[PDB]
Amino acid sequence: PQAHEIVIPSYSKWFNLEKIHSIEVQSLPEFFTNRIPSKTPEVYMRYRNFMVNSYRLNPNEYFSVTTARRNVSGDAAALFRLHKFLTKWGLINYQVDSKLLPKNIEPPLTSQYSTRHDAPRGLFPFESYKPSVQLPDM
Amino acid sequence: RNFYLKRFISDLLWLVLIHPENFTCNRKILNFKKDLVIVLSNISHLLEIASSIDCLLILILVISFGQPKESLTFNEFQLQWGKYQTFGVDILAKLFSLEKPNLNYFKSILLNKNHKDKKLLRRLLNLYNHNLLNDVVSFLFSAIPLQQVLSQSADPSLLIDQFSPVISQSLTSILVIVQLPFVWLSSEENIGSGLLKLSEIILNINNSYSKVLLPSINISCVQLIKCLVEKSICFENCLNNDPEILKKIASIPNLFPTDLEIFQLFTNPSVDIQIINQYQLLYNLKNDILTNLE
Amino acid sequence: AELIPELYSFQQLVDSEKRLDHFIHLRNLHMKRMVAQW
Amino acid sequence: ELNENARELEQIKPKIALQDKEITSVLSNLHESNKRYRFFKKISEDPVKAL
Amino acid sequence: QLLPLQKAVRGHVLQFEWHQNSLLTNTHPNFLSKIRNINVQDALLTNQ
Amino acid sequence: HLPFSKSENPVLSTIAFLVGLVNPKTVQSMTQRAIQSAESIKSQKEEISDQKPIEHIKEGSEIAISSLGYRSHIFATNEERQMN
Amino acid sequence: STIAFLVGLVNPKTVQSMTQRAIQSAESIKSQKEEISDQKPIEHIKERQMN
């Protein structure tokens, strides 16, 4: 079931609840040297998706690392590390507060799209004189 | 402490100077050199992790400025164009004051003429070809003279005077670091020393900005005596040169304030005790050289 | 700036007398220091 | 005599200034001509690509 | 009949990506080269 | 043009051969060593016997003479340049 | 071509710029043999670049 409108600070638009990215490993490598068998990318992803789901459930109100610690753990240390990490990356606890505005209007508006000088791809505002017709066209 | 920032500085240097061509506009290179030396100016504390390479880099960076053409290799800069050549010596003082047994020591090894790093170092010195730090001396000898002593007054001096003293400071400091096979002497119809006339200028100013004047003149005198005696004793220890050196030393118009000036000095200001001692010992060495010459 | 007195950096140095008039200018600077100190 | 020497040095100065003006002029002309020669020889190389 | 549409949205995304290659090469502002001289504080700091 | 089927509008004129001849005459190489020249009409006989492409051969020859005249003026000009 | 590689801009047209509009038909070998002939004519009419 889905019952909320979830936004994220766009630059984060590299994260995918399905997969992992070179970003986080360079920020949390301690699950990837394959040295500590009790840790693995897999349990990492488990924790990850679990927590993000939790937050996305009722994101209007905050979510603590202590919460997850109560819920599931294999460690406090790494748990906190990654939790605060995602916090930084706003994937979690980002919409804890709401802010609004009346937004008065100005001459530029999103529904304004007219004919005017253009920086984009080519366009020809002057077509052809008379003698151009003088060609054995295709 | 932004170990990251320092790594950045280091490798950026290692590129900009050893630059296989990937940079488009030389002006970009100038920009890099320029804002780099500036941001250096705003540092007044430690540097030189994995030092030696970085130390040589910074030296080449400051040496970037000033017109080249033994003897002094640097035409003194006609001070109406540049302002970075300033920043150069500014840093070579500030970021070099730390007598901690690292930086000074790195340059001291630069007197000479993972582990592969060491291979690199000498690799560049012979790739800069004797000695080299004489070039640093010559560079330091720029922006001071030949314009203020050639002006119409001593007031417009004070501006660049404020700038001047750190230079002499740097110089005498590095002369603590020269006390082995060399050939060095740097008063050979190359600068003379208007330092005496300059000292006279600041003196007349005294009895007629501030807070820098007395130290400037003092260290100027100390510089004179120390470089003199060090040259003499050095080529004594080597003894590769005829005693003509004395005669040679005795043959400078820019030297040895006249004893009449000493006398008249000894009377009027009476506010320069330490400076009086400076000139005193100076004249002492002068008269000594005169005597023991014969 | 440096542009104003000279620009001689490299011109292919065809008929490289530029070194010579260079030296001339250098000795002019020499004479300049000379007269100043005189 | 020092005053005399200063006076005659000042006497000769403006001629030097004029010569410096001429220097600047001929230098700029040299510079333009250099540009032109570079252009032209590059044309000499293989006019297709240069064009 | 659809062609102009693809051309249009193409131009949209094209200008969009092109915008990324703009890093103020267009201009060359001053970068606060404040230190005309090093002030008194610099020298006295060196001595101190 | 030929690299541009879009050509300048015309009903009776002369454009390409015009500039062709301008550059040609400019060459002044009265003994221009190039594509076959004239010493006996048999040269033209064999040329026509060889001239069988629609225009491509002709075009190559044209641009060749173009480049030639350029090169000549270039040499002379750059000589004057070094002189200056 | 001239237009086929330029739009919303163009070389002016009062001089012999149509040389551009005839940009290439044998570029490499053409220009090569042209340089051959150029150096050849140089050496021929020739019989250091100063007097």
XYZ file of C-alpha atoms in Angstrom:
704
model
C 0.000 0.000 0.000
C 1.099 3.592 -0.641
C -0.249 6.608 1.207
C 2.314 9.423 1.146
C 4.159 11.766 -1.186
C 7.887 11.186 -0.828
C 10.446 13.622 -2.199
C 14.229 13.520 -2.008
C 17.018 16.016 -2.600
C 17.575 15.220 -6.244
C 21.364 14.850 -6.224
C 20.663 11.694 -4.274
C 19.008 10.432 -7.479
C 21.598 7.747 -7.808
C 20.347 5.574 -4.967
C 18.158 2.613 -5.804
C 16.466 0.481 -3.172
C 17.350 -2.416 -5.483
C 21.072 -2.018 -6.047
C 24.255 -0.522 -4.641
C 26.534 2.187 -5.943
C 30.243 2.949 -5.834
C 29.356 6.040 -3.796
C 28.388 4.330 -0.570
C 31.210 1.786 -0.614
C 33.720 4.617 -0.816
C 31.847 6.009 2.180
C 31.246 2.753 4.099
C 33.903 0.291 2.945
C 33.804 -1.782 6.089
C 31.331 -4.181 4.456
C 33.344 -4.900 1.350
C 36.888 -5.979 2.127
C 35.308 -9.409 2.662
C 37.420 -9.694 5.810
C 34.754 -9.890 8.534
C 32.426 -12.734 7.500
C 29.669 -11.566 9.845
C 29.390 -8.553 7.530
C 28.540 -8.602 3.839
C 27.014 -6.384 1.151
C 23.902 -8.467 1.599
C 23.179 -7.746 5.254
C 24.113 -4.173 4.451
C 21.410 -3.925 1.805
C 18.990 -5.605 4.189
C 19.577 -2.967 6.853
C 19.512 -0.252 4.212
C 16.176 -1.092 2.640
C 14.668 -1.848 6.030
C 15.513 1.567 7.407
C 14.528 3.501 4.316
C 11.179 1.730 4.242
C 10.698 2.522 7.917
C 11.328 6.211 7.344
C 9.239 6.391 4.192
C 6.328 4.917 6.105
C 5.559 7.920 8.333
C 8.236 10.359 7.161
C 6.396 13.362 8.576
C 7.866 12.453 11.971
C 11.481 11.636 12.743
C 13.157 8.239 13.012
C 16.094 7.417 15.269
C 19.026 5.068 14.958
C 18.163 3.899 18.467
C 14.868 2.760 16.993
C 16.494 0.381 14.530
C 18.955 -0.705 17.219
C 15.981 -1.821 19.273
C 14.457 -3.405 16.178
C 17.353 -5.244 14.544
C 21.086 -5.324 15.066
C 24.313 -7.056 14.282
C 26.237 -4.116 15.707
C 25.655 -0.752 17.270
C 28.727 0.880 15.754
C 28.192 0.158 12.066
C 24.461 0.609 12.515
C 24.995 4.143 13.766
C 27.602 4.818 11.103
C 25.333 3.935 8.212
C 22.268 5.478 9.838
C 23.937 8.842 10.294
C 25.349 8.406 6.802
C 21.949 8.030 5.166
C 20.841 10.913 7.358
C 23.520 13.052 5.766
C 22.376 11.857 2.380
C 18.855 12.715 3.430
C 17.503 9.387 2.258
C 16.160 9.166 5.803
C 14.665 11.728 8.161
C 14.568 14.361 5.421
C 10.883 15.326 5.467
C 10.736 15.560 9.251
C 9.460 19.126 8.976
C 7.204 20.935 6.540
C 7.478 24.463 5.185
C 5.037 26.420 3.046
C 4.662 29.656 1.089
C 1.957 31.693 -0.693
C 4.283 32.337 -3.672
C 3.139 35.558 -5.302
C 3.653 35.780 -9.053
C 6.122 37.477 -11.396
C 6.383 38.059 -15.185
C 8.074 34.656 -15.600
C 5.896 31.613 -15.008
C 6.056 27.905 -15.766
C 3.155 28.115 -18.235
C 4.907 30.757 -20.363
C 6.315 29.521 -23.698
C 6.185 31.940 -26.641
C 8.062 32.797 -29.833
C 11.288 34.667 -29.128
C 15.040 34.472 -29.711
C 16.323 31.000 -28.950
C 19.563 29.562 -27.598
C 18.500 25.973 -28.558
C 19.024 23.876 -31.674
C 18.649 25.374 -35.139
C 15.659 27.292 -36.451
C 15.082 29.401 -39.553
C 12.948 32.565 -39.272
C 13.373 33.577 -42.935
C 12.476 31.052 -45.616
C 12.901 31.961 -49.269
C 12.719 34.764 -51.828
C 10.985 34.469 -55.201
C 13.728 33.075 -57.505
C 14.174 30.119 -55.155
C 11.048 28.700 -56.805
C 13.147 28.557 -59.963
C 14.512 25.160 -59.108
C 13.640 21.753 -60.591
C 12.761 20.527 -57.148
C 12.401 16.966 -55.867
C 45.493 19.997 8.745
C 43.229 19.458 5.771
C 45.575 16.646 4.791
C 43.328 16.440 1.765
C 44.039 20.044 0.828
C 47.757 19.442 1.200
C 47.671 16.332 -0.970
C 45.854 18.463 -3.513
C 48.460 21.206 -3.383
C 51.257 18.683 -3.710
C 50.004 16.755 -6.693
C 48.770 19.920 -8.403
C 52.271 21.325 -8.101
C 53.829 18.087 -9.318
C 51.708 18.491 -12.411
C 51.831 22.205 -13.173
C 55.607 22.176 -13.322
C 56.188 18.646 -14.616
C 53.335 19.123 -17.051
C 53.051 16.745 -19.944
C 50.711 18.673 -22.159
C 47.066 18.472 -21.261
C 46.440 22.102 -20.299
C 44.810 24.180 -23.002
C 45.453 27.843 -22.296
C 48.766 28.929 -20.818
C 46.735 31.656 -19.147
C 45.164 28.836 -17.168
C 48.656 27.922 -16.014
C 49.252 31.514 -14.982
C 45.965 31.575 -13.084
C 46.953 28.395 -11.290
C 50.392 29.644 -10.314
C 48.877 32.952 -9.288
C 45.979 32.040 -7.053
C 48.118 29.195 -5.721
C 50.839 31.491 -4.469
C 48.121 33.782 -3.125
C 46.452 31.066 -1.077
C 49.921 30.164 0.127
C 50.312 33.741 1.354
C 47.334 33.138 3.614
C 49.152 30.269 5.315
C 51.522 30.960 8.187
C 52.051 27.490 9.627
C 53.345 24.011 8.851
C 53.601 22.438 5.415
C 55.742 19.918 3.579
C 54.396 16.478 4.263
C 56.403 14.104 2.074
C 58.280 17.359 2.063
C 61.343 17.299 -0.147
C 59.430 17.129 -3.402
C 56.979 19.743 -2.141
C 59.756 21.988 -0.877
C 61.529 22.013 -4.219
C 58.176 22.591 -5.902
C 57.437 25.654 -3.808
C 60.916 26.992 -4.438
C 60.448 26.689 -8.164
C 57.052 28.331 -7.825
C 58.433 31.403 -6.123
C 61.361 31.460 -8.549
C 58.797 31.702 -11.354
C 58.916 35.475 -11.172
C 61.637 38.005 -11.822
C 63.563 38.442 -15.036
C 66.612 36.251 -15.556
C 69.280 37.186 -18.085
C 79.187 33.715 -11.986
C 76.979 36.556 -10.788
C 73.406 37.438 -9.947
C 71.064 35.864 -12.472
C 68.175 38.245 -11.850
C 67.585 41.731 -13.110
C 65.887 43.437 -10.190
C 62.219 43.941 -10.969
C 61.218 47.440 -12.055
C 58.419 47.853 -9.531
C 55.523 49.145 -11.495
C 54.084 45.960 -13.032
C 53.880 43.044 -10.659
C 52.556 42.292 -7.233
C 52.974 38.512 -7.046
C 56.782 38.488 -6.881
C 55.887 40.027 -3.560
C 53.780 37.069 -2.447
C 56.696 34.845 -3.338
C 59.147 36.162 -0.775
C 56.222 36.763 1.577
C 55.647 33.026 1.722
C 59.314 32.096 1.547
C 59.481 33.949 4.840
C 56.204 33.092 6.571
C 55.994 29.419 5.638
C 59.694 29.181 6.301
C 60.004 30.802 9.727
C 59.303 27.459 11.395
C 62.747 26.428 12.550
C 61.146 23.143 13.455
C 63.620 20.481 12.366
C 61.699 19.829 9.165
C 61.338 22.716 6.722
C 64.648 24.478 7.175
C 66.061 20.971 7.172
C 64.415 20.100 3.870
C 65.964 23.141 2.242
C 69.232 22.218 3.935
C 69.123 18.876 2.164
C 68.356 20.984 -0.876
C 71.796 22.383 -0.352
C 73.098 18.991 -1.496
C 74.276 18.479 -5.057
C 58.505 5.153 -1.287
C 62.292 5.194 -1.528
C 62.056 6.036 -5.231
C 60.989 9.500 -4.046
C 64.612 10.178 -3.149
C 65.644 9.120 -6.645
C 63.236 11.780 -7.891
C 64.810 14.574 -5.899
C 68.353 14.486 -7.238
C 66.709 13.518 -10.528
C 65.482 17.104 -10.734
C 68.575 18.883 -9.452
C 70.739 17.510 -12.234
C 67.647 18.145 -14.336
C 68.212 21.751 -13.332
C 71.641 21.878 -14.969
C 77.614 24.083 -9.183
C 74.704 25.116 -6.997
C 71.202 26.515 -7.340
C 70.208 28.286 -4.130
C 72.327 31.203 -5.335
C 69.394 31.710 -7.671
C 67.214 32.012 -4.585
C 69.602 34.632 -3.250
C 69.408 36.637 -6.466
C 65.629 36.380 -6.448
C 65.501 37.633 -2.877
C 67.627 40.535 -4.033
C 64.772 41.905 -6.098
C 62.161 44.622 -5.557
C 64.189 46.375 -2.873
C 66.574 48.819 -4.571
C 67.158 51.083 -7.527
C 63.736 52.669 -7.431
C 63.329 54.078 -3.942
C 66.991 55.062 -3.840
C 66.313 56.588 -7.271
C 63.103 58.424 -6.363
C 62.650 62.083 -5.490
C 61.735 61.458 -1.831
C 61.761 58.819 0.880
C 58.069 59.021 1.770
C 56.724 56.879 -1.126
C 59.280 54.349 0.064
C 57.424 53.602 3.312
C 54.748 51.739 1.368
C 57.023 49.104 -0.165
C 59.236 49.516 2.888
C 56.507 47.796 4.922
C 57.032 44.993 2.454
C 60.821 45.087 2.498
C 61.914 43.794 5.917
C 60.627 40.242 5.589
C 63.001 39.896 2.644
C 66.154 40.760 4.554
C 64.826 38.576 7.356
C 64.523 35.605 5.017
C 67.988 36.302 3.677
C 69.835 36.445 6.984
C 67.865 33.405 8.098
C 69.093 31.388 5.142
C 72.568 32.637 5.946
C 72.277 30.773 9.222
C 72.075 27.774 6.890
C 75.412 28.105 5.069
C 78.062 27.883 7.821
C 82.103 21.536 1.529
C 82.764 22.011 -2.186
C 81.283 25.321 -3.335
C 82.215 28.588 -5.020
C 80.079 31.391 -3.603
C 80.376 35.168 -3.302
C 77.643 37.669 -4.109
C 79.168 41.153 -4.041
C 80.860 41.301 -7.441
C 79.723 44.474 -9.249
C 76.280 42.949 -9.167
C 74.509 44.865 -6.388
C 77.118 46.675 -4.471
C 75.119 47.587 -1.415
C 72.988 50.677 -1.290
C 71.904 49.115 1.993
C 74.162 51.682 3.605
C 72.569 54.597 1.794
C 69.173 53.062 2.532
C 70.030 52.822 6.210
C 71.091 56.457 6.103
C 67.747 57.277 4.510
C 65.737 55.585 7.229
C 68.008 57.184 9.816
C 67.431 60.705 8.528
C 63.757 59.765 8.490
C 64.003 58.766 12.147
C 65.417 62.133 13.237
C 62.902 64.012 11.080
C 54.661 53.604 8.155
C 56.305 52.866 11.489
C 57.239 50.013 13.837
C 59.381 48.365 11.145
C 61.998 50.992 10.483
C 64.489 50.321 13.272
C 64.361 46.521 12.801
C 64.824 46.920 9.065
C 67.960 49.029 9.387
C 69.310 46.848 12.188
C 68.957 43.623 10.258
C 70.367 45.328 7.185
C 73.574 46.027 9.063
C 73.624 42.512 10.510
C 73.133 41.120 7.014
C 76.078 43.117 5.760
C 78.479 41.971 8.441
C 77.369 38.360 8.392
C 77.568 37.917 4.634
C 80.955 39.616 4.611
C 82.462 37.450 7.306
C 80.898 34.257 5.997
C 82.252 34.865 2.502
C 85.690 35.587 3.903
C 85.872 32.587 6.213
C 84.366 30.303 3.578
C 86.945 31.069 0.949
C 89.494 30.902 3.747
C 88.470 27.355 4.633
C 88.536 26.399 0.971
C 91.568 28.648 0.404
C 91.107 28.249 -3.328
C 91.574 31.982 -3.900
C 94.376 34.460 -3.448
C 94.388 36.851 -0.475
C 93.445 39.452 -3.104
C 89.945 38.763 -1.739
C 90.799 41.096 1.121
C 91.869 43.744 -1.365
C 88.801 42.744 -3.356
C 86.718 43.141 -0.205
C 88.556 46.368 0.442
C 87.406 47.669 -2.926
C 83.722 48.517 -2.469
C 82.329 52.070 -2.621
C 79.061 50.805 -1.101
C 80.764 49.637 2.061
C 82.100 50.525 5.482
C 80.347 53.726 6.618
C 82.901 56.492 6.950
C 84.255 57.045 10.429
C 83.147 60.668 10.292
C 79.598 59.420 9.863
C 80.183 57.120 12.833
C 81.346 60.063 14.905
C 78.518 62.431 14.029
C 76.109 59.535 14.535
C 77.531 58.954 17.995
C 76.107 62.332 18.996
C 72.807 63.489 17.547
C 70.082 60.801 17.755
C 71.135 59.086 20.994
C 68.048 56.902 20.500
C 69.634 54.027 18.611
C 71.863 52.290 21.172
C 71.606 48.836 19.636
C 72.042 50.307 16.158
C 75.039 52.198 17.473
C 76.520 48.869 18.534
C 75.729 47.439 15.112
C 77.631 50.171 13.328
C 80.302 49.917 16.018
C 81.114 46.258 15.448
C 80.760 46.846 11.718
C 83.433 49.532 11.731
C 85.454 47.273 14.009
C 85.538 44.496 11.439
C 86.288 47.119 8.803
C 89.351 48.422 10.614
C 90.399 44.860 11.375
C 90.338 43.981 7.691
C 92.311 47.118 6.934
C 94.987 46.259 9.481
C 95.443 42.552 8.907
C 95.359 43.120 5.150
C 98.999 44.093 5.345
C 53.427 45.477 -18.451
C 56.226 43.162 -19.568
C 54.550 43.551 -22.959
C 55.384 47.244 -23.076
C 59.231 47.070 -23.190
C 59.449 43.820 -25.116
C 57.717 40.707 -26.350
C 60.705 38.617 -27.443
C 60.007 35.067 -26.362
C 60.218 32.986 -29.530
C 59.482 33.894 -33.099
C 61.141 30.890 -34.746
C 64.116 33.235 -34.228
C 64.711 33.254 -37.961
C 68.065 34.945 -38.548
C 68.521 34.909 -34.808
C 70.008 38.331 -34.309
C 67.379 38.737 -31.609
C 69.863 37.291 -29.149
C 72.277 40.035 -30.124
C 69.984 43.022 -29.755
C 68.839 41.244 -26.615
C 72.399 41.442 -25.294
C 72.410 45.074 -26.332
C 69.377 45.769 -24.168
C 70.974 43.776 -21.357
C 74.071 45.932 -21.464
C 71.802 48.961 -21.476
C 70.426 47.762 -18.154
C 74.047 47.291 -17.125
C 74.818 50.919 -17.953
C 71.663 51.935 -16.133
C 72.775 50.364 -12.875
C 76.205 51.834 -13.582
C 75.024 55.418 -13.915
C 72.650 55.060 -10.973
C 75.329 53.874 -8.599
C 77.636 56.513 -10.024
C 79.530 69.393 -11.416
C 76.980 66.895 -10.153
C 74.282 69.422 -11.005
C 75.741 69.858 -14.483
C 75.762 66.107 -15.030
C 72.177 65.763 -13.847
C 71.152 68.606 -16.139
C 72.751 67.116 -19.233
C 71.349 63.677 -18.432
C 67.902 65.240 -18.272
C 68.758 67.011 -21.521
C 69.313 63.685 -23.249
C 66.353 61.872 -21.611
C 63.510 62.929 -23.965
C 65.368 61.710 -27.030
C 65.498 58.363 -25.259
C 61.754 58.595 -24.651
C 61.144 59.179 -28.356
C 63.321 56.204 -29.215
C 61.274 54.091 -26.804
C 58.088 55.169 -28.543
C 59.618 54.073 -31.835
C 60.592 50.800 -30.178
C 57.017 50.141 -29.115
C 55.777 50.997 -32.594
C 58.179 48.782 -34.496
C 57.574 46.036 -31.958
C 53.839 46.039 -32.559
C 54.461 46.056 -36.297
C 56.851 43.136 -35.928
C 54.133 41.395 -33.952
C 51.446 41.827 -36.591
C 53.817 40.800 -39.361
C 54.669 37.728 -37.317
C 51.002 36.817 -37.128
C 50.698 37.258 -40.875
C 53.707 35.076 -41.592
C 52.458 32.330 -39.294
C 49.115 32.427 -41.072
C 50.673 32.372 -44.513
C 53.133 29.559 -43.957
C 50.393 27.512 -42.336
C 48.499 28.053 -45.570
C 51.617 26.896 -47.407
C 51.505 23.643 -45.458
C 48.354 22.063 -46.888
C 45.786 24.682 -47.817
C 42.855 22.282 -47.503
C 43.011 21.887 -43.735
C 44.096 25.470 -43.126
C 41.183 26.749 -45.182
C 3.641 14.417 -38.156
C 5.403 13.747 -34.860
C 8.877 14.888 -35.993
C 8.666 18.513 -34.757
C 7.782 17.217 -31.309
C 10.882 15.069 -31.061
C 12.936 17.942 -32.427
C 11.536 20.228 -29.742
C 12.068 17.988 -26.738
C 15.441 17.120 -28.202
C 16.355 20.779 -28.121
C 15.086 20.947 -24.565
C 17.330 18.184 -23.279
C 20.165 19.365 -25.504
C 20.238 22.859 -24.063
C 19.918 21.199 -20.688
C 23.041 19.071 -21.014
C 24.902 21.855 -22.809
C 24.291 24.008 -19.761
C 26.594 21.691 -17.841
C 29.588 22.655 -19.924
C 29.373 26.250 -18.659
C 31.857 27.106 -15.903
C 32.321 30.863 -16.129
C 34.862 30.711 -18.857
C 32.472 33.321 -20.261
C 33.742 35.899 -17.773
C 36.931 36.489 -15.771
C 36.068 38.257 -12.522
C 38.542 39.409 -9.943
C 39.137 36.814 -7.231
C 39.823 39.060 -4.232
C 43.536 39.652 -4.715
C 43.276 41.714 -1.563
C 46.823 41.657 -0.355
C 48.193 44.595 -2.279
C 50.953 44.795 0.249
C 51.387 42.464 3.128
C 50.307 44.662 5.999
C 52.216 45.458 9.166
C 50.693 42.372 10.775
C 52.504 40.103 8.326
C 55.984 41.444 9.013
C 55.577 41.779 12.758
C 54.070 38.292 12.724
C 57.174 36.939 11.048
C 59.383 38.594 13.647
C 57.162 37.497 16.521
C 27.166 23.063 -55.881
C 28.486 19.517 -56.182
C 29.133 18.961 -52.491
C 25.874 20.908 -52.186
C 23.111 20.017 -54.639
C 21.667 23.275 -53.399
C 23.304 25.652 -55.867
C 23.018 29.386 -56.368
C 20.015 30.317 -58.473
C 20.848 31.088 -62.092
C 19.553 30.843 -65.642
C 22.550 32.134 -67.657
C 25.789 32.951 -65.813
C 29.227 31.553 -64.962
C 30.480 31.099 -61.400
C 32.859 28.212 -60.685
C 35.051 28.369 -63.773
C 35.286 32.120 -63.177
C 37.118 31.920 -59.859
C 38.930 28.893 -61.246
C 40.413 31.045 -63.994
C 41.097 33.907 -61.596
C 43.249 31.661 -59.426
C 44.765 30.066 -62.530
C 45.887 33.324 -64.133
C 47.081 34.437 -60.715
C 49.560 31.544 -60.665
C 51.789 33.189 -63.298
C 53.602 29.843 -63.539
C 53.911 30.072 -67.310
C 55.691 26.724 -66.952
C 53.414 25.350 -64.239
C 54.382 21.742 -63.687
C 51.011 20.132 -63.014
C 48.399 17.967 -64.709
C 49.276 17.529 -68.376
C 50.171 20.748 -70.189
C 50.579 21.817 -73.805
C 53.476 21.039 -76.106
C 51.577 19.356 -78.971
C 47.870 18.846 -79.626
C 48.423 15.133 -79.019
C 48.652 16.116 -75.355
C 45.039 17.261 -75.562
C 44.187 14.172 -77.602
C 45.462 11.885 -74.849
C 43.889 14.114 -72.199
C 40.437 13.732 -73.725
C 41.234 10.038 -74.130
C 41.828 10.153 -70.370
C 39.165 12.726 -69.498
C 36.234 10.364 -69.074
C 34.946 10.985 -65.550
C 31.694 12.915 -65.342
C 33.343 15.772 -63.485
C 35.363 14.264 -60.618
C 38.619 14.201 -62.580
C 37.939 17.747 -63.736
C 37.227 18.804 -60.159
C 40.421 17.275 -58.829
C 42.345 19.103 -61.527
C 40.588 22.368 -60.683
C 41.293 22.263 -56.968
C 44.830 21.164 -57.791
C 45.501 24.285 -59.830
C 43.808 26.270 -57.071
C 46.193 24.957 -54.437
C 49.018 25.577 -56.896
C 48.316 29.266 -57.329
C 47.944 29.555 -53.582
C 51.287 27.903 -52.869
C 53.008 30.236 -55.314
C 51.541 33.392 -53.795
C 52.274 31.952 -50.361
C 55.958 31.421 -51.064
C 56.325 34.906 -52.503
C 54.375 36.578 -49.714
C 56.187 34.822 -46.885
C 59.478 35.733 -48.520
C 58.415 39.372 -48.391
C 57.336 38.751 -44.798
C 60.742 37.595 -43.630
C 62.179 40.547 -45.532
C 59.999 42.929 -43.532
C 30.582 21.587 -47.072
C 30.475 25.338 -46.509
C 26.831 25.313 -45.460
C 26.827 21.577 -44.710
C 29.246 22.449 -41.896
C 27.965 25.881 -40.864
C 24.614 27.420 -40.044
C 23.250 30.636 -38.553
C 26.609 32.044 -39.712
C 28.655 32.128 -42.885
C 31.656 33.568 -44.633
C 30.910 36.901 -46.257
C 30.419 37.092 -50.006
C 31.901 39.858 -52.067
C 35.356 38.350 -52.671
C 36.408 34.910 -53.918
C 34.971 32.914 -51.045
C 33.272 30.395 -53.350
C 36.678 28.729 -53.256
C 35.260 27.465 -49.975
C 32.063 26.264 -51.652
C 34.448 24.122 -53.710
C 36.145 22.773 -50.628
C 37.580 19.419 -51.648
C 37.713 16.697 -54.243
C 41.185 15.063 -53.861
C 42.485 16.951 -50.839
C 45.394 14.868 -49.602
C 47.109 13.708 -52.787
C 46.116 16.862 -54.639
C 47.782 19.115 -52.076
C 50.737 16.734 -51.866
C 51.516 16.902 -55.573
C 50.758 20.612 -55.417
C 53.488 21.051 -52.814
C 55.705 18.960 -55.061
C 55.075 21.357 -57.932
C 55.470 24.382 -55.655
C 58.905 23.393 -54.401
C 59.746 22.356 -57.959
C 58.867 25.763 -59.372
C 60.766 27.353 -56.502
C 63.936 25.456 -57.376
C 63.393 26.014 -61.102
C 62.833 29.771 -61.113
C 65.606 29.950 -58.511
C 68.289 29.197 -61.104
C 70.181 31.520 -48.749
C 67.190 33.798 -49.323
C 69.136 37.077 -49.363
C 71.461 38.954 -51.693
